[model samples]
Target: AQYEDGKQYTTLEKPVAGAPQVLEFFSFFCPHCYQFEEVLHISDNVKKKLPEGVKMTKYHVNFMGGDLGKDLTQAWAVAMALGVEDKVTVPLFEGVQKTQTIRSASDIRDVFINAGIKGEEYDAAWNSFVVKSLVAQQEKAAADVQLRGVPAMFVNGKYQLNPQGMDTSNMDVFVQQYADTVKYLSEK
Candidate 1:
């Protein structure tokens, strides 16, 4: 469990308290986020290597979408509520980054529909209090962190990963170092 503060990570002023977890602040509109998901498989790669009982929580930040940001966040909330986070992540990412076809609520609904989630079911979850609350909380949390970028990782909500601090010459090395930082920080 070796890391350097100010280099590898910076401590949070107000650390989140709960089960040890990694909070990922990301946006579907971000090309870098898409590469990390599709090319690097960063989330699953890091998740599988994290310590036991430590989970990863993703918060779809609304800042990147401009006027469509909230809709994107809402879409993610619905996906999570429906337990289709795994099912829709790539499709949504591709829709925004590759296909460029997801521009409205209707488009978002179609993505879910294509994922085997019926239109009525999608609407029900989208309008549910649970999903709405999660969206609100996500916005608040995004603001609370004063988040400035995508695919940002915070271990235990206390330690922020510094990309420049890790060796990024090779993709495999980069992921391994990131996973190492997460594991180290989790035990701290």
Candidate 2:
């Protein structure tokens, strides 16, 4: 659960203390992950309803190759470093799904700039040591997890929810089930 130094997305210092962490494994180019965004948003809204001490973090998977994946991973790292995660994360996903244009680092940077992130800050974050560290950490995590695809979920470091590995059509329902599973584990 420890990211390589300087590579972490958030200045979380440590994992959410005394909380059952809901770790969602996903990829930027994933259609299912795109579709699951609404669910994740709704789930975020519903998080307050959960018992105390529950937290969720999205851990993007980068198994997809090509410039698209690289741009996304870099953009995500920049966003995380700049403290504008929500601004860049959702719109970047939408852009990849809707636009046929090839997603490159510049394109992702445009998205971040459009999201009110200052150009200088974005540029600095992209070139900063933190971003490079994150890129390396992501590569290492992808290998360590032996990740095969997108939209997977890991609850409390034990249970896994790989949509491709399961038999289900409704992704929202499956995601909800995964959240419920996390809640169940939290109570244990």
Candidate 3:
């Protein structure tokens, strides 16, 4: 069986041309996304297999927690801007998805503070032009897709991965299948 168009992926109506990149559309309030990033740690494994020069980005959609979703998206932007993504991804995900401890922007700020970022620094990044711009970009991309679900992955901003036929029973095989398809699409 060979990979086929519309099975592994569907081409974007307006394909984005640029250096190869992978983007994940997700939300903190989405349990599936929590599993994708934390429980199974899929992205961490996938990143290891991607070809050199390929970048992976995470876009937090604004539909999950209503206003809170937008705040979390801003939180994510701050984390990226501060280079504290690794420090906060798990805590924020756990706070929102499992513990249900995160409920507002202030709570999100605490996560960064607990992760060793100074409160003042987090506040600045939260309001900085850079973080604001990133948030806008994430919002625009989510709206552009009229996204239907969370934990969606796109390679090179052109191939929307289906993950429909991939074997998930065997974790190794599934990851390999995912990485292979992304690699194939990225090089196209």
Candidate 4:
């Protein structure tokens, strides 16, 4: 279904802070999640259209209990804690979705090392108490966020975007539609 710069999401019962936050829920194994980056960059529109004080964050979802994805989820949490999220974000995607060289926890470490993080630094992050704690929370957050699917977008933790129904196959239309909808929801 198509929406006319429409509102097709829910407003959360709780308020979130600091301007407007656009949270993306995704899993590395999900192709659609990786595709989102391509779409977001294709038009070069959303970046220019972003309102002041608007912040975007990608939350890696790991709902699979006792699975390898859970390992990656913790790995991501560790990266986030160490402030190297930028370092691993794309490489992780590339290894898994592009080259397929990254298949296990060990492969993930190679990506980090190749990204210039030293072995000792990697060790600190890998086994840090904070990373461990966040990893525990990640499992719950994946569900508590009320996600419908990978690559889903949430605004300020208060509204969920209906991008799955968007006419985004056209980058131009997608850019305008995405920006307008997000901006409208942010202002409200």
Candidate 5:
């Protein structure tokens, strides 16, 4: 299968000297992904403790049913294009998981505003060429990765971590194991 760099697969060609690159594959509509959100935050904190070169990237997969998946993928792409990913990621996730109401484009926009990201800026970015390209890229990823679900993670492009694949039934332990795996891979 053909994979586009920065879309389907990002090459750590010139890796951050000693930093391990972590990639998380997730979806906004997935209940499991929502459940894993808090645990994933711990991974972020763990990243901070790592050596100078560790990098983490979160990719939203749009394989779920309904418009929810499409909206999430587009939202993520737009945020990336606007250079506001760090500003909106947590907020967007929180809105989806905490708000008890159905998520809509407006809700996502509100989340952007709440996260200190300008609404106009997000609008501009959403329609920009970068996001356009991201949409195409995501399509490519869906096919190339052969993904069937959400919240799958990759460590240094070498190992894949999926809740369904693990024997451990505990979510917390699974998340810790994921961080530990990334830490170990980064050191190798």
Candidate 6:
């Protein structure tokens, strides 16, 4: 996908190998990321479809800063480890974006419990040996990508989409371009 003005994204020297990884950099407090959560959930939305040999991953960033950012992003990691992101993703998004209810680890724990997740499962996921390592890996990758904001997409760790300026009136137009670029990089 090419911009109307022929603008091209700067490419990192090396994209992630093994497969075409569509890495999303997001934050629980990011307003735009919150919007895309719903868009991504909708049937046939760009985030939903993937060609063969492609998979998506995500990292929670703290561009928002401070305790809330720490609490929420770390909780994001914990939730993903617990395999409850599908159930809690929108709820956490809505909790902060609308209800403003999630303020601590305890609050996030309750969210998982309320999602029909067993307390044991939640505890196991929370204390999983991999969660802290994953969080560290997230920081390392963020530095490699020079991440600056949320709601950003990285195509195989090579191209980082700048979310600052895009046509917000029509997200399909934008998501299509992103999807196309991912397809192109994967095919290459």
- Candidate 1 lDDT over 13-127, as tens digits, reads 8776652378888899988789889988888888878877777788899879887778989988998888899889999999888989988889888888898999889988988
lDDT score, residue 57, model 1?
Answer: 84
Query: Can you give the TM-score per candidate against the true fold?
Result: 0.93, 0.74, 0.92, 0.80, 0.71, 0.82
Alpha-carbon lDDT, every model? 0.83, 0.61, 0.83, 0.70, 0.64, 0.68
lDDT: worst 10-residue window of model 4: 38-47
Q: For model 5, what is the alpha-carbon lDDT of residue 79?
A: 77
Error of 1 at 22 (Å): 1.2
lDDT of 3: 0.83
Q: Write the per-residue lDDT of candidate 3 for residues 35-72, one digit (tens) a residue.
A: 77776776887788788877888888888889999899
Clashing pairs in 3: none
Better of 2 and 6 by lDDT: 6
True-vs-predicted CA distance for residue 149, candidate 1, Å: 1.5
Question: Residue 121's C-alpha lDDT in candidate 4?
Answer: 87
lDDT of model 6 at position 86: 85
* All-Cα superposition RMSD per candidate: 1.7, 8.4, 1.7, 3.6, 7.6, 3.1
Q: After superposing candidate 4 on the true structure, give the runs of residues whose Cα lies further than 4 Å from its correct spot.
A: 1-20, 42-48, 64-66
The number of clashing residue pairs in each candidate reads 0, 1, 0, 0, 2, 0
Superposed by TM-score, candidate 5 places the C-alpha of residue 7 at a distance from the truth, in angstroms, of 28
Q: Model 2 over residues 1-188: C-alpha lDDT tens digits?
A: 32222221222332333323565656777887776674455346336445777677665656674767776777777776777877776777777777744357777778877888889988988889999887776565555445686665544544444334322577556556545544554454
Error of 3 at 52 (Å): 1.5
- Candidate 1: give the clashing pairs: none
TM-score winner between 3 and 5, please give it: 3
